[PDB]
Amino acid sequence: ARRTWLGDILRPLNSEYGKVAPGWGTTPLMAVFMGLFLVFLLIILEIYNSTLILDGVNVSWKALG
Template identity: 50%
Template sequence: MGQKTALGTLLKAIGNSGQGKVVPGWGAVPIMTVIGLLLLVFLVILLQIYNQSLLLQGFSVDWNGN
């Protein structure tokens, strides 16, 4: 068996203090849902710009950089 040191005891007390604790209810689900939906909208807009189904004035999409 290993030696017990003051540092090891301190680190063990700090590291395991929140283990197994879960916030009751929905927690952060509403916030993560909003962030996920915003990311989805952003990606759809990028896809539409790339496919040229969303046209912007003065903005062309091509591989030559023109």
């Protein structure tokens, strides 16, 4: 090894290696934002594809100036 000023100061940030939460930890909470993101994309996708029209949002070079 070879410690160094910067090296020590950063020593903490990299040390908790294999440290894991137990069981199904935060998984379920995660599986929700995940599903939320999935729906969020489908929306912005379907908006760009003009499948989901929304007065106020005009997906053309127009609506510009």
